[PDB]
């Protein structure tokens, strides 16, 4: 209409009168107008930007919503948002404001050069830990756009574009374990699309190792086998029945199975009672507010316009209060019936028809989908399924590929697996034993890495797998690296019987290593360390100066001997004075040269903590621990692997709260790490079980010293001493590091309860 102009200029004249007197009303009126007509905000945009750094409340949310409408019709917008501190308004904790900030970013991304998208990206990737699924969903939307539009469109893009792609890919990988059933499904269908992971199974199996990222290691094997068994669901033999002929002839009815979380099991009923872009999973089936009051034309839905309204506001408020009483009484039910509906809500995957004989006419789906369904839950069965699929697919690679492409498939697989074993920090036992089990089977992967294999299955207690891999590599000049790493694997499970026949003089090793091992076999560790450290400073070798892996073996075994005796001063000196050059030792250099983490760190923490636990007041471990908690990786390493060390350390400064958190973390870490060791790895499970007593003594001490009645008399102390003097590891079977843990922890607990307590001392 013609009347556009005289009306929009009238509305703009009233808003122009507003924008200088009351800006609080100017932005409310402008937000309400440009909810519906956005071209009015074009003439007010610099006066919205001017007022934007002034409001801090809901009014800044309204200002940003006015900005959000005109993002495509704005030319620069990054310099204006950067002047107005957009990165710091994104970190304001408000879900509406953060959602509108992320929506502004999403609309202005196809007009950003990489040098400013990289500045915007560092606060965007902080929304992984955001509680709202709406902001996380918007973050995954903009990262999916970055992945689709930054896959090197030209010959060699700059460093900015490459780092942008790397950061987006890291967070997009990390969103495959997202704690929301459907955000994870969006990210999983994003990755399972044909343009990102291929459809060829031999090349999908290679592209799967690109999306590893040490964060997701507990989930990687189930995710990989999910992405691999995607492709069965688009095969022309997938809904076909696997056997076309039944055993005999009988008709089969339809059997529906009652699986509801009310009668979960048969045991909870007494007797008779008074009755007589894509969110889709291929596995579980195939499954603001306005002020205008005028915001269907039928024949049944317009008899509810025959409405009465009680003009008894007192009675109406009484009915609403009684209503809210009923809702408060039903919340008390729902917040228990939903915590019961969480642990007995099972889904069924197959079809289940019943007859007179077993119905051997299952589809291929009725075997594949429960297989992936249980690989998604149990990690051992995911390890076995991934090993089976990887070995089968490389076996069926032989008819396609000839020799020129097979070799640079296996070179890429060797590079990928070396990357896995060199960057894992959570040495997850199914993951480590899976990629050291699929390496034994194929001879082109037997050249994996000797020191990464040794460190991995020493940290995950999976030493038989690494022993089999190293021995098969020594099959097929002596390879002294592999012989020394194999001997380091054998030494940690005991097995000095095997160790005698390794260090003869045909592999090039010295005689001092054999003599020290023969002394260590009879548990004569002081005479073993006496010549280990003697060999570690000797430079006049009359048959060749020793190779480096042998000297690393002497270093590690001498540290083990000092740990085995009790010598905590020599242990901290030997673990500490090899990471620093000068006489002041800088303990924070232990996090570079990744040798230092698996070599010197457990002995460093253990020796300093034992010296703290018996007397000495050198506060040099607490500084290292608090400095290491600043990093997002070092904190994960420390609270995943030690946490009992940490619980005792925080108990030493009377911090019984952080010690509570760390001992509960240690118990959960015990259960997860114990139940993921394969069942026929006995003495791996024995050494995982040997450590539960110290965890529960720390928990029992915390529970004892927390109750105030325990500190009143000497009755509960006498009962605690009466149970501690009957609770021991067994002689002849539990080693001396277990005994030293129990006894040193118990002595420190008794000293703490004594100094807190008011003939008690003779009893303790």
């Amino acid at each position: 209409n013609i009347l556009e102009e005289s009306l929009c200029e009238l509305v703009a004249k009233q808003l122009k009168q507003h924008q200088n007197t009351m800006e609080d009303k100017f932005i409310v009126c402008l937000n309400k107008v440009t909810k519906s007509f956005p071209p009015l905000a074009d003439r007010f945009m610099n006066a919205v930007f001017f007022l934007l750094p002034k409001f801090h409340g809901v009014l800044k949310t309204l200002c940003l919503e006015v900005v959000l409408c005109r993002v495509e019709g704005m030319t620069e917008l990054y310099f204006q948002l950067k002047s107005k501190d957009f990165v710091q308004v994104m970190r304001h904790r408000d879900d509406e404001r953060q959602k509108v900030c992320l929506d502004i970013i999403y609309k202005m991304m196809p007009k950003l050069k990489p040098v400013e998208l990289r500045e915007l990206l560092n606060p965007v990737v902080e929304f992984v830990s955001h509680p709202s699924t709406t902001c996380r969903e918007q973050m995954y939307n903009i990262l999916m756009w970055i992945h689709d539009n930054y896959r090197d469109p030209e010959s060699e893009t700059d460093n900015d574009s490459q780092e942008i792609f790397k950061l987006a890919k890291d967070v997009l990988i990390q969103g495959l374990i997202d704690e929301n059933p459907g955000l994870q499904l969006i990210i999983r269908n994003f990755w399972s699309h044909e343009t990102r992971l291929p459809s060829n199974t031999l090349d999908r199996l290679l592209a799967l190792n690109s999306l590893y990222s040490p964060k997701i290691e507990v989930h990687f094997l189930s995710l990989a086998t999910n992405f691999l068994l995607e492709m069965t669901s688009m095969s022309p033999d997938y809904p076909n029945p696997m056997f076309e002929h039944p055993l005999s002839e009988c008709e089969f009815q339809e059997y529906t199975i009652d699986s509801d979380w009310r009668f979960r099991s048969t045991v909870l009923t007494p007797m008779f009672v008074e009755t007589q872009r894509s969110s889709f999973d291929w596995l579980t089936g195939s499954s603001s507010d306005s002020l205008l009051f005028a915001h269907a034309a039928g024949r049944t839905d317009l008899l509810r316009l025959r409405r009465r309204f009680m003009r008894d506001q007192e009675k109406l408020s009484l009915m609403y209060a009684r209503k809210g009483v009923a809702e408060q009484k039903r919340e008390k039910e729902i917040k228990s019936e939903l915590k019961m509906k969480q642990d007995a809500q099972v889904v069924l995957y197959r079809s289940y028809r019943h007859g007179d004989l077993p119905d051997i006419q299952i589809k291929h789906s009725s075997l594949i989908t429960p297989l992936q369904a249980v690989a998604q839950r149990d990690p051992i069965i995911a390890k076995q399924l991934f090993s089976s699929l990887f070995s089968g697919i490389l076996k069926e690679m032989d008819k396609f590929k000839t020799l020129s492409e097979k070799n640079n498939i296996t070179q890429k697989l060797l590079q990928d697996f070396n990357r896995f074993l060199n960057t894992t920090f959570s040495f997850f036992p199914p993951f480590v034993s899976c990629i050291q089990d699929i390496s034994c089977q194929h001879a082109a992967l037997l050249s994996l890495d000797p020191a990464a294999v040794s460190a991995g299955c020493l940290a995950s207690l999976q030493q038989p797998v690494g022993i089999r891999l190293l021995e098969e590599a020594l099959l097929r000049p002596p390879d002294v690296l592999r012989w020394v790493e194999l001997a380091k694997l054998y030494r940690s499970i005991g097995e000095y019987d095997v160790l005698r026949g390794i260090f003869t003089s045909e592999i090039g090793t010295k005689q001092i290593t054999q003599s020290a091992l023969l002394a260590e076999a009879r548990s004569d560790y002081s005479e073993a360390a006496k010549q280990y450290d003697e060999a570690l400073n000797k430079q006049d070798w009359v048959d060749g100066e020793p190779t480096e892996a042998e000297k690393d073996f002497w270093e590690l075994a001498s540290l083990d001997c000092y740990n085995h005796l009790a010598e905590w001063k020599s242990l901290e000196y030997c673990s500490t004075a090899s990471i620093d050059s000068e006489n002041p030792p800088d303990l924070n250099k232990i996090w570079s040269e990744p040798f230092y983490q698996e070599t010197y760190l457990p002995y460093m923490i253990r020796s300093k903590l034992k010296l703290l636990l018996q007397g000495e007041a050198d506060q040099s471990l607490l500084t290292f621990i608090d400095k290491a908690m600043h990093g997002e990786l070092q904190k994960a390493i420390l609270e995943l692997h030690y946490s009992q060390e940490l619980s005792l350390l925080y108990l030493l400064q009377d911090d019984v709260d952080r010690a509570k958190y760390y001992i509960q973390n240690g118990i959960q870490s015990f259960m997860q790490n114990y139940s993921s060791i394969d069942v026929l790895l006995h003495q791996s499970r024995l050494t995982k079980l040997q450590s539960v007593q110290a965890l529960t003594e720390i928990q029992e001490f915390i529970s004892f010293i927390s109750k105030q009645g325990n500190l009143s008399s000497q009755v509960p102390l006498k009962r605690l001493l009466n149970t501690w003097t009957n609770r021991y590891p067994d002689a002849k079977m539990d080693p001396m590091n277990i005994w030293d843990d129990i006894i040193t922890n118990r002595c420190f607990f008794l000293s703490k309860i004594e100094e807190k307590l008011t003939d008690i001392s003779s009893l303790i």
Partner: protein
């Protein structure tokens, strides 16, 4: 989450742009206190309690070290309203 918010809170106290540091500090305090209030698992609640009442970082040493300053009184007001 928390302890990152607390270390950035202690960093926004020796900064050079006062009254520009306090707005960031107030947002750190608000998100921190929101996380501490909305927890119900007694393992992480003891961790968050020990981090809030910590002596290196922590809200009490924040309001102590930010007490010779008028730009930080909204931060101190929000901390004392969180602690109740």
């Amino acid at each position: 989450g928390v302890r990152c918010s607390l270390l950035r809170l202690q960093e926004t106290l020796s900064a050079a742009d006062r009254c520009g540091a306090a707005l960031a500090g107030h947002q750190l305090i608000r998100g921190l206190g929101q996380e501490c209030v909305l927890s119900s698992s007694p393992a992480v609640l003891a961790l968050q309690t020990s981090l809030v009442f910590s002596r290196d970082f922590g809200l009490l040493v924040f309001v102590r070290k930010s007490l010779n300053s008028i730009e930080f009184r909204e931060c101190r007001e929000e901390i004392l309203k969180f602690l109740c």
